[PDB]
């Protein structure tokens with residue numbers, strides 16, 4: 001079953017964890033990836049009440065199970081922070097425009 005459902009996409013905790021490890025890794029060395037430069041800051045225009053502290057950084061999570069290294073970032077994101085803590089998993093799918101909704 002799914003630990004996170006982002007629209008059609010099914011993720012296990014192992015998935016979330018692998019994207020989160022890449023994102024904080026790039027984030028530690030001050031390196032980016034893609035034409036949108038992931039990882040980058042997540043502002044929270046949304047207003048989600050994360051259990052975890054600011055500030056946040058987002059990084060694509062791929063439906064393929066592959067870790068993102070460029071190309072289409074897809075619709076799903078993993079939100080973490082300076083402490084390497086999972087804030088949550090969000091998605092543009094089902095969200096109006098470039099808005100985000102949370103993965104269930």
Ligand SMILES: Nc1nc2c(ncn2[C@@H]2O[C@H](CO)[C@@H](O)[C@H]2OP(=O)(O)O)c(=O)[nH]1
Nearest residue numbers: 036041042043044045046058077098099100
């Ligand atoms: N909706 C939303 N987009 C954000 C936020 N912070 C950064 N963004 C990025 O800014 C774009 C539009 O403002 C979004 O598509 C998103 O890029 P990503 O597609 O890389 O997530 C945020 O808090 N909310």
Ligand SMILES: [Ca+2]
Nearest residue numbers: 011012015065
């Ligand atoms: Ca998987």
